[PDB]
From a paper:
Two related RING E3 ligases, Arkadia (RNF111) and [name] (RNF165), have central roles in the regulation of Transforming Growth Factor β (TGFβ) signalling.
To understand the molecular basis of activation of ﻿[name] transfer by [name] we solved the structure of the [name] fusion in complex with [name]~Ub. Crystals of the complex that diffracted to 2.8 Å were obtained following purification of the stable [name]–[name]~Ub complex, and the structure was solved by molecular replacement. The density was well defined for most of the structure, and for [name] residues 1–73 (UbR), as well as 258–274 and 289–341 of [name], could be positioned, while for the conjugate residues 1–147 of [name] and 3–76 for ﻿[name] were resolved. Contacts between residues in β2 of UbR (Thr9, Lys11 and Thr12) and the C-terminus of α1 of UbD (Gln31, Asp32 and Gly35) extend the E2~Ub binding surface by ~190 Å2 so that in total ~1080 Å2 of the E2~Ub conjugate is buried in the primed conformation. Comparison of the structures of UbR bound [name] in the presence and absence of the E2~Ub conjugate shows that close-packing at the UbR–UbD interface is, in part, achieved by displacement of UbR in the activated complex. In the structure of the activated [name] complex, crystal packing contacts position a ﻿[name] molecule close to the active site of [name], such that Lys6 and Lys48 are ~11–13 Å from the active site raising the possibility that a UbA binding site has been captured.
Author numbering:
A (entry chain C): 0 to 147
B (entry chain D): 3 to 76
C (entry chain A): -3 to 73, 258 to 274, 289 to 341
The structure:
């Protein structure tokens, strides 16, 4: 009752105003389960690639954050092989003033701005924090073999 | 330039190419009520840091920036 | 209104309103000038300058206000929400259309409405649920317990 109405309203605005380099929408008649496309950040090694994501809306939405996960494999210090994204705004820095289009654009901003000091996959963090040149090469190969 | 704010209202801003990003965040603070601590600006999927200017990103007239709350990769 | 000179006011989020005033302006006129720029009734406003709060029926020069002076704008005054927040019913002006960032529906006359010490606006039902679990503002991340 209380949550589906926002998902309805977000969807209408998404149709009339398609976001900047990002497409999303529900699967079938499941309004709490969406898919999403994400474009590559312009300077980052993921540039030009398209990344798929699963999103699940909790029943408490928008008071609790939506569960967002990558399905395309991506090489990133804060995104593991299971597609998980540990991101503060998806956990405790969550605000109900964030729509999906702005959540998705926040994720693309994370790709252009990794954080190795507080990592999720520390193996990827060390490679970044010692020679970003070799990190950018690997991340570029991952985004070209899965997301092009 | 234009800015998509958290309320969805695209707002016009009058800046010249010499303005830094911290300048732009301050103008948004006066028209939105959000401190530059909590402002994250995004153009073409990439974030914009407080140090560099608008011309350093070669952002030209009528470009549309987007505004989300400050993130922290974890 | 093309006042003889200008002053500024600062909200909790650091937002700055520039006003045109003459030293012979009453304070209730200053509150109304802010009403025509952000949509806050003088009913809700509380102004603070030089450690003292300004009373309705005096003048700016009585409080010895200068050019480039800065006023501070705070709100006038499960149940702790009603102790830090101002409830009222919205009144539409006449961009001046406001929407609730929680339910994403625009704000209408007669709707029970909420305003936080950051001078942001939401429906009463929508933000009362969110404040029941975070006590911060969805738009600017300012605690409602801020003073
Ligand atoms: Zn609402
Ligand atoms: Zn606020």
């Amino acid at each position: 009752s209380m949550a589906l109405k926002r998902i309805h309203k977000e969807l209408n605005d998404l149709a009339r105003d398609p976001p900047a380099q990002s497409r999303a929408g529900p699967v079938g008649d499941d309004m709490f389960h969406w898919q999403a496309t994400i474009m590559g950040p312009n300077d980052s090694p993921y540039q030009g690639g398209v990344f798929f994501l699963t999103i699940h809306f909790p029943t408490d939405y928008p008071f609790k954050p939506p569960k967002v996960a990558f399905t395309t494999r991506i090489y990133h210090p804060n995104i593991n092989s299971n597609g998980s994204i540990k991101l503060d705004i998806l956990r405790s820095q969550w605000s109900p003033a964030l729509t999906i289009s702005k959540v998705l654009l926040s994720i693309s901003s994370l790709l252009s701005d990794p954080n190795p000091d507080d990592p999720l996959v520390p193996e990827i963090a060390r490679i970044y924090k010692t020679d970003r040149e070799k990190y950018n090469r690997i991340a570029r190969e991952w985004t070209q073999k899965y997301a092009m | 330039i234009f800015v998509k704010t958290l309320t969805g209202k695209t707002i016009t801003l009058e800046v010249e190419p010499s303005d830094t990003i911290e300048n732009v965040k301050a103008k948004i603070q006066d028209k939105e009520g959000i401190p530059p601590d909590q402002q994250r600006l995004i153009f073409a999927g990439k974030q914009l840091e407080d140090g560099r200017t608008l011309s350093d990103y070669n952002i030209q007239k009528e470009s549309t920036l987007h505004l989300v709350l400050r993130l922290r990769g974890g | 209104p093309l006042g003889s000179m200008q002053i500024f006011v600062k909200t909790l989020t650091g937002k700055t309103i520039t006003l045109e005033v003459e030293p012979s302006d009453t304070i209730e006129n200053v509150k109304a000038k802010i009403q025509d720029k952000e949509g806050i009734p003088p009913d809700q406003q509380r102004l603070i300058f030089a450690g003292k709060q300004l009373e309705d029926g005096r003048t700016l020069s009585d409080y010895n206000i200068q050019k480039e002076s800065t006023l501070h704008l705070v709100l006038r005054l499960q149940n702790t929400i009603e102790r830090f927040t101002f409830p009222h019913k919205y009144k539409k002006r006449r961009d001046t259309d406001e929407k609730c960032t929680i339910c994403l529906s625009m704000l209408e006359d007669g709707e029970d409405v909420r305003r936080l010490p950051c001078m942001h606006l939401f429906h009463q039902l929508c933000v009362d649920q969110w404040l029941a679990m975070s006590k911060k503002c969805p738009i600017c991340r300012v605690d409602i317990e801020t003073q």
